[PDB]
């Protein structure tokens, strides 16, 4: 797998920050900042050769969208998917929640095209709308997939909050093979990992997990407080939240830890290449 360049991921975060500032200060469902975010991600993918689909749905009286991107080729009967929600809450730009995961998945998709990668499994990437209203966009996607198509899913990898300013390195404990793939990557960097417990079923992997699709993912922490033992293994500040700007107006470009964002972007690419071979 390629090393994902941190500067390219940060450039996507800068564009999402400008989009929020030009649209009222947020990228929330039903507000202009959300569709403008979708348009930016779609344009980058279409230029790189992906087949893109916009899936529209209505929630809370307003139109939302999921953006699905398929890399042509690979086995149609074994699909590996990776995704991230693209909406924010209405209090701010949502740069760590979840510009961080959205930008890492987007740069991984661009890296597949730049590398001229031809995977054995078919690759599909998704950016979900309306996650902050209760996983509405990912539930819409799973509820509308025919059973024949659901059975072709080999795994779904989720990236939601991966650049927290006082980070921890948490790996989901769902499918064992996906979990081992991430743990082995961090082992090679000599960075310890812990099992994800703060978010539980509260992100877009839940609808997939509930229908039997293997899932996994990465998380760097939200409102919970980092312990002394955790600061000893990862640095940072014990007694402070992992993300002091969770769902706040201060979840801006300054609310990102570059080391954690780079490590988790590189781990995302490593898992995508490893599991699609
Ligand atoms: C990964 S669980 C914590 C984040 C939560 N899904 C959110 O969007 O706020
Ligand atoms: Ca990197
Ligand atoms: Zn989130
Ligand atoms: Zn959130």
């Amino acid at each position: 797998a390629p090393d994902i360049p941190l500067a390219n991921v940060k450039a996507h975060l800068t564009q999402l920050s400008t989009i929020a500032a030009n649209n009222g200060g947020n990228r929330a469902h039903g507000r202009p900042g959300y569709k403008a975010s979708v348009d930016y991600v779609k344009a980058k993918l279409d230029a790189a050769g992906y087949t893109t689909t916009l899936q529209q749905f209505t929630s809370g009286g307003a139109t939302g969208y999921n953006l699905i991107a398929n890399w042509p080729g690979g086995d149609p009967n074994k699909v590996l998917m990776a995704g991230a929600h693209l909406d924010s809450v209405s209090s701010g730009a949502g740069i760590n929640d979840n510009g961080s995961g959205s930008a890492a998945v987007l740069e991984t998709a661009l890296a597949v095209s730049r590398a001229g990668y031809q995977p054995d499994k078919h690759l599909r990437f998704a950016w979900w709308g309306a996650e902050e209203l209760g996983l509405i966009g990912s539930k819409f996607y799973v509820n509308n997939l025919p059973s024949a198509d659901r059975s072709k899913l080999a795994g779904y990898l989720n990236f939601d909050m991966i650049g927290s300013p006082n980070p921890g390195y948490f790996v989901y404990d769902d499918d064992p093979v996906i979990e081992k793939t991430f743990k082995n990557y961090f082992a090679g960097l000599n960075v310890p990992t812990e099992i994800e417990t703060e978010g539980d079923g509260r992100s877009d992997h839940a609808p997939f997990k509930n229908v039997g699709v293997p899932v996994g993912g990465l998380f760097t922490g939200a409102g919970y407080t980092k312990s002394a033992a955790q600061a000893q293994k990862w640095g940072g500040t014990a007694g402070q939240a992992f993300d002091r700007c969770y769902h706040s107006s201060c979840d801006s470009l300054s609310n990102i830890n570059d080391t954690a964002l780079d490590r988790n972007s590189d781990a995302a690419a490593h898992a995508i290449w490893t599991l699609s071979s």
Side-chain angles (χ1 to χ4, degrees), residues 1-199 201 203-277:
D3 175 351
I4 294 299
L6 173 65
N8 287 9
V9 183
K10 292 264 283 188
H12 302 310
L13 293 181
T14 299
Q15 291 299 313
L16 291 176
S17 176
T18 301
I19 285 165
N22 288 166
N23 292 101
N26 64 69
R27 307 181 302 96
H29 173 77
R31 310 225 185 170
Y34 179 72
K35 181 54 162 56
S37 297
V38 167
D39 290 346
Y40 171 76
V41 177
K42 189 179 186 293
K44 294 289 187 166
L45 295 164
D46 282 340
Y50 282 83
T51 293
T52 55
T53 303
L54 269 180
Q55 181 174 61
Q56 191 181 302
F57 55 89
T58 299
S59 195
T63 301
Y65 309 86
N66 296 321
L67 170 65
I68 309 299
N70 279 275
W71 182 236
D75 184 353
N77 296 305
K78 290 179 168 121
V79 178
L80 179 72
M81 283 198 71
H85 72 99
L86 184 64
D87 64 316
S88 68
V89 287
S90 63
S91 64
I95 294 309
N96 188 36
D97 183 18
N98 183 38
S100 64
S102 291
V105 175
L106 172 60
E107 190 62 20
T108 296
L110 298 178
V112 162
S113 177
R114 286 200 300 266
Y117 181 44
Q118 179 168 285
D120 287 327
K121 296 191 178 69
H122 173 71
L123 293 173
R124 181 180 296 150
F125 297 94
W127 288 264
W128 311 118
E131 186 274 345
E132 298 286 8
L133 271 65
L135 322 184
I136 299 303
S138 51
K139 281 176 179 189
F140 184 87
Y141 181 82
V142 176
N143 284 345
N144 285 285
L145 272 188
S147 63
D149 288 331
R150 203 142 77 228
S151 71
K152 289 170 194 163
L153 298 176
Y156 171 70
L157 306 180
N158 194 55
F159 301 92
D160 184 357
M161 298 182 69
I162 58 167
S164 302
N166 179 24
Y169 292 86
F170 301 102
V171 180
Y172 294 14
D173 181 34
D174 293 301
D175 181 82
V177 173
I178 291 172
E179 176 180 7
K180 187 165 190 307
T181 299
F182 287 124
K183 280 172 155 284
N184 284 172
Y185 181 75
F186 281 101
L189 302 182
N190 200 28
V191 171
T193 59
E194 285 184 9
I195 291 174
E196 198 301 305
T197 63
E198 172 168 24
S203 190
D204 295 297
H205 60 302
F208 289 92
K209 181 170 171 181
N210 286 346
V211 301
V213 177
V215 306
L218 301 173
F219 173 58
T220 50
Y224 280 7
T225 307
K226 175 178 275 180
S227 76
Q230 288 169 327
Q232 197 62 223
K233 59 171 74 153
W234 301 309
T237 313
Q240 293 294 303
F242 292 101
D243 187 343
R244 278 177 279 195
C245 288
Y246 179 54
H247 285 186
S248 306
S249 61
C250 59
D251 184 11
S252 64
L253 285 177
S254 58
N255 198 46
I256 289 292
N257 179 285
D258 279 2
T259 298
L261 180 65
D262 186 26
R263 286 171 174 166
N264 284 307
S265 295
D266 291 342
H270 176 81
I272 290 173
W273 255 255
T274 295
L275 295 168
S276 55
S277 288

